[PDB]
Design a binder for this molecule. Structure first.
Ligand SMILES: [Zn+2]
Ligand SMILES: [Zn+2]
Length: 140
């Protein structure tokens, strides 16, 4: 799907491993999808790329759970419709303390995003949910 204002989040939590795949039209992240001609356009892309480099902050992961970034890919053309793909593998020393997942911070920092669609998979099974700025929590 490429619906402006909607992003997909796949989440896989197995023991100490946390895996996060975000797919999004750029419209909700930089505010356009045209090539980055100008240099008030180039700044807008650098800002986005920077917030996407700090997943512990953007996904508001508890510090209690001792989560570390193992690895991180950010593919996009901007790095005539355009997507942005972000992939993160994370290692958490105390995953028992990963109770909830808030996209509150995400909606804060990319407010042109109206909805995120979450797949979660753990050893417990598969969970699905539309998150909105109102309703932005999911129980793991
Ligand atoms: Zn588009
Ligand atoms: Zn990927």
């Amino acid at each position: 799907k490429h619906e402006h204002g909607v992003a997909q989040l796949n989440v896989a939590l197995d023991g100490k491993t946390l895996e996060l795949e975000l797919d999004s039209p750029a419209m909700n992240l930089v505010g356009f999808e045209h090539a980055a001609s100008t240099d008030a356009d180039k700044a807008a892309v650098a800002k986005a790329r920077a917030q996407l480099e700090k997943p512990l902050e953007l996904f508001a992961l508890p510090v209690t759970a001792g989560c570390s970034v193992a690895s991180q890919e950010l593919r996009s053309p901007l790095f005539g419709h355009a997507d942005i793909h972000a992939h993160y593998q994370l290692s958490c020393e105390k995953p028992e303390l990963l109770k909830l997942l808030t996209l509150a911070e995400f909606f804060k920092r990319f407010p042109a995003t109206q909805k995120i669609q979450v797949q979660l998979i753990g050893p417990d099974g598969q969970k699905g949910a539309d998150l909105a700025p109102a309703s932005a929590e999911l129980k793991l």
